[PDB]
């Protein structure tokens, strides 16, 4: 395989999501667990609160709450940074500007603690508004399709991406993400530096009906694509 990194995750590898939130001054904290196996691109995670009813709807922390797990194909493995950045792990920094509403600025790390991969974030959001679509929770919960268009940051030895996620509003309407994205690898060991390339993303949100915390059940499928077959 052409990184080392790649070797971890040729298997189904256990996943840890932590996330401390504050929104508005609203704080909340989510806790995830599941698997990931990159060689079908394929999560399946469940979010519970541990702060209670949540101050923002779930579908909005999706892209928030480990793009290591996609499927690249055989003739794209060279470009798959985010592989080649483990066990070590990589640093994801966004903003997420909601369209007429407030933004989300996200720090997170990437990386192996012993078998499993944890994704740790840290999220603040200002300016959001009392009766809009995000404070107000007035998102569907169900379903939504995304598409990175992934390109090399030479100068941070890392990648960035920018990115329209579309969330449809109850009822009627869609509420716009504008997604700002960089990596960089926590190590000092080579990474891949990737050509542009996507990576695509579906995710189906459900519930578990025996659950009485405030949480997501979520299948994710992730994979690249964008780079022809000679």
């Known amino acids: 395989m052409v990184s080392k990194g790649e ?7 256990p996943i840890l999501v932590e996330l401390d939130g504050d929104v508005n001054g609203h704080k909340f904290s989510v806790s995830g667990e599941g698997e990931g196996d990159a060689t ?3 999560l399946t995670l469940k979010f519970i609160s541990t702060t209670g009813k949540l101050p923002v709807p779930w579908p909005t922390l999706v ?5 290591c797990f996609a499927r690249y194909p055989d003739h794209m493995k060279q470009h798959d940074f985010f592989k080649s950045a483990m066990p070590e792990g990589y640093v994801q920094e966004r903003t997420i500007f909601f369209k007429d509403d407030g933004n989300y600025k996200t720090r997170a790390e990437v990386k192996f603690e012993g078998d499993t991969l944890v994704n ?3 999220l603040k959001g200002i300016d959001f508004k ?9 998102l569907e919960y169900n379903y939504f399709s995304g598409n990175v268009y992934i390109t090399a940051d030479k100068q ?5 991406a920018n990115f329209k996620i579309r969330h449809n509003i109850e009822d009627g309407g869609v509420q716009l993400a504008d997604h700002y994205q960089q990596n960089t690898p926590i190590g000092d060991g080579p990474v891949l530096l990737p050509d542009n390339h996507y990576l695509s993303e579906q995710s189906k949100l459900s519930k578990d009906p025996n659950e ?8 994710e499928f992730v994979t690249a694509a964008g780079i022809t077959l000679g």
């Open 130 to 138: 009392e009766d809009g679509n995000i404070l107000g929770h007035k």
């Open 40 to 42: 079908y691109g394929k």
């Open 7 to 13: 070797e971890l995750f040729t298997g189904v590898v």
């Open 120 to 122: 740790r974030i840290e």
């Open 212 to 219: 009485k915390r405030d949480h997501m059940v979520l299948l």
């Open 63 to 67: 892209t928030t709450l480990v793009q």
């Open 156 to 160: 941070k030895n890392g990648i960035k």
